[PDB]
Amino acid sequence: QDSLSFGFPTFPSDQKNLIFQGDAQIKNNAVQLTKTDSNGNPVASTVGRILFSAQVHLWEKSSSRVANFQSQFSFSLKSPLSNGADGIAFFIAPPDTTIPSGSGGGLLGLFAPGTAQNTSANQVIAVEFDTFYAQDSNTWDPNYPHIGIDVNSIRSVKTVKWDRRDGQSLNVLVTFNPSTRNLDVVATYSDGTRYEVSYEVDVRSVLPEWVRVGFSAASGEQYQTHTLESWSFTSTLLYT
């Protein structure tokens, strides 16, 4: 289809169109990307991702069209530790994508250690909300929590300073305009605090014609819950 849209105001336990990978599962009308014990407390060494089952037609070679898409979502992070890790990400990748071997911790369940920074060995665009930046392990990160745009590498093409707020929902709007090739990110907390970051990128040179979209999160030695609360997505092919 040239156009596709779906909306999850909440996530009831009875799901049919989501692909669960790793430890991801539904609990209390929300998606818990990373594993939690019986008490709902976060645990270390966990990775999980979800993908919408229907494939999205991102671009079409034969007609020279590229999709205009928007993804609106909300999530919250919680941890008794002073340094919850590692972060959550909205991503776009090939339909057959699976959790790479050894992609836990700072790799956010998106990249393999051996090629995490080799832009030629990957096909993925992601918007990350990174809370762990230890300069001895995450050598590619700026020294502070941040929002980053990733294109085929864990070392973001760009980042902006962001504040982690335990237990507070962050609303995010990610949009892509094929005319200007701008990928825009706008995130806000309930008190009005706003964060914005933008990057120009031609998706045709990075991703195949058909892709799947979803979320990924992970925790290494340090941990926190990564709770996806709602998600709406729309995409339509346009002439460019």
Give the residues lining the site for a second copy (CB under 8 A): 1-9, 12, 14, 16-17, 53-55, 57, 60, 62, 95, 209-210
- Phi, psi of 237, rounded to the nearest 5 degrees: -70, 135
**CB atoms < 10 A from the CB of 191, how many?**
7
| Closer residue to a second copy, CB minimum distance, 117 or 240 | 240
Residues that bind Ca ion in the complex, under the rule CB under 5 A:
106, 130, 132, 138, 141, 148
Helix (H, G, I), strand (E, B) or coil at 204: helix
Nearest to 97 by CA among 32, 19, 153, 23: 19
Q: What minimum distance in Å lies between the beta carbon of 200 and a second copy?
A: 28
* Residue with the CB atom nearest Ca ion in the bound state: 130
Under a CB-based contact definition with an 8 Å cutoff, are residues 91 and 124 in contact? yes
| Residues 119, 135: Cα–Cα separation, whole Å | 22
Q: What minimum distance in Å lies between the beta carbon of 190 and a second copy?
A: 23
Please name the residues in contact with 220: beta carbons below 8 A apart, sequence gap of 6 or more.
Answer: 44, 45, 85, 86, 104, 105, 106, 132
Q: What minimum distance in Å lies between the beta carbon of 94 and a second copy?
A: 12
| Closer residue to a second copy, CB minimum distance, 3 or 21 | 3
| Closer residue to a second copy, CB minimum distance, 93 or 147 | 93
Of these partners, a second copy, Ca ion, none, which one is at the site of residue 106 (CB under 5 to 8 Å by kind)? Ca ion
- Phi, psi of 199, rounded to the nearest 5 degrees: -150, 140
Q: What minimum distance in Å lies between the beta carbon of 45 and Ca ion?
A: 16
| Closer residue to Ca ion, CB minimum distance, 23 or 150 | 150
